[PDB]
């Protein structure tokens, strides 16, 4: 993809009625890090599934192992869960040449606080201003009220 979504705002897509070649991507190695959980990095397009999902988001290099089936970590536990009952591959490309800007990338918004941790394969794109304090948010930012 030219561009991904943030982790919290996880971009979900479903594969059905087609064939994707997972072993080809692994061996061409256009992504720098390939880790697979419950599935093989190769000879995987020989395994039959009816609903294959391939979803896109952005993480840091130290987070690549965290976003994975059966794994935990700050990103895996708070902004995108992947339970032990699921299997799949986590494929990561360093996009620094397209996405990094001096001053930061404002097209991707990272979630720090949620009232509860985000669920398995849940997408949430909300920017509703977070209520941290006792004084309710009025649709504007203020102390203990922030995007």
């Amino acid at each position: 993809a030219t561009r991904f979504a943030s982790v919290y705002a996880w971009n979900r897509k479903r594969i059905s009625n087609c064939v994707a070649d997972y072993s080809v991507l692994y061996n061409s190695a256009s992504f720098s890090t390939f880790k697979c959980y419950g599935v093989s990095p190769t000879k995987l397009n020989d395994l039959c599934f009816t609903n294959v999902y391939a979803d896109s988001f952005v993480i840091r290099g130290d987070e690549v192992r965290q976003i994975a089936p059966g794994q935990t970590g700050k990103i895996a536990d708070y902004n995108y869960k992947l339970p032990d009952d699921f299997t799949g591959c986590v494929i990561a490309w360093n996009s620094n040449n397209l996405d990094s800007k001096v001053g930061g990338n404002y097209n991707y918004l990272y979630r720090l606080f949620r009232k509860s941790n985000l669920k398995p394969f849940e997408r949430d794109i909300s920017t509703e201003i977070y209520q941290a304090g006792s004084t309710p948010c009025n649709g504007v930012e203020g102390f203990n009220c922030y995007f």
């Epitope: 700050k74 304090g133 930012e141 102390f143």
Partner: antibody
Framework: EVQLVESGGGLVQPGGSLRLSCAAS????????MHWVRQAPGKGLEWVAG????????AYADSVKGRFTISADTSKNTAYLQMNSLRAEDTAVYYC?????????????WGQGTLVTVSS | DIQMTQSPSSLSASVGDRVTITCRAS??????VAWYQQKPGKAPKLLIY???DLYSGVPSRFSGSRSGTDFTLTISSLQPEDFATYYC?????????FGQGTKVEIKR
């Protein structure tokens, strides 16, 4: 390398006041709140006050509410703390610090501290 | 007003050993738990800015994780320059509070 630098320390008579200042170096204050943190002799850290650099919203620690006032200025890339009605118990090293938004993040930027004493 | 408690008040570890500090807020502060290092005469140095994130410029020796409500705060391989009083901080809400300070001995 990003650092903050405190100034304006000194001595206050009980019931008096002192104004602290801190300048940021190596980064842009916008997007972060500016905070003041205190360490009295024999004590660990206690947060005192803070303001959002890009919004102007403020809040204070319960221990200083109604007594302390703060401000920040992103064109100067500096910040201030006005401490009135001080007592001997407020003797402490005051530190400047900055963090994202209005909270939830730690002090991404931190200074060296300046000593403020109060005494009879 | 959310208070923080730490335990133990001191830990004994030699150079190369591990130091573990347990800290918790009285109320949830989510992932926002920081860590500072203080030597006599100096400002505490920020090590961790949030429980979830290590501060830039800080050695990889310093790390931690969450389980339930608690924050396990640790030094994986203690160095001579790490013998300092450490503080745990929550920064979710105001006032921002800190624990009591945990000291480290070098097993002499």
């Amino acid at each position: 390398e990003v650092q903050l630098v405190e100034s304006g320390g000194g001595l206050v008579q009980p019931g008096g006041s002192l104004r602290l200042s801190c300048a940021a170096s190596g980064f842009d204050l916008g997007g972060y709140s500016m905070h003041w943190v205190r360490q009295a002799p024999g004590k660990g850290l206690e947060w005192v006050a803070g303001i959002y650099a890009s919004g102007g919203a403020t809040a204070y620690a319960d221990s200083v509410k109604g007594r302390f006032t703060i401000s920040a200025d992103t064109s100067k890339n500096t910040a201030y703390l006005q401490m009135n009605s001080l007592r001997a118990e407020d003797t402490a090293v005051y530190y400047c610090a900055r963090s994202y938004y209005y909270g939830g993040f730690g002090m991404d930027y931190w200074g060296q501290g300046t000593l403020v004493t109060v005494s009879s | 007003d959310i208070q923080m408690t730490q335990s133990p008040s001191s830990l004994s570890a030699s150079v190369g050993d591990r130091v573990t500090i347990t800290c918790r807020a009285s109320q949830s502060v989510s992932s926002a738990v920081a860590w500072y290092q203080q030597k006599p005469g100096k400002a505490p140095k920020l090590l961790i800015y949030s429980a979830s994130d290590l501060y830039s410029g800080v050695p990889s020796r310093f790390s931690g994780s969450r389980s339930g409500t608690d924050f396990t705060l640790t030094i994986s391989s203690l160095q001579p320059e790490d013998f300092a009083t450490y503080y745990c901080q929550q920064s979710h809400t105001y006032p921002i509070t800190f624990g009591q300070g945990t000291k480290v001995e070098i097993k002499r």
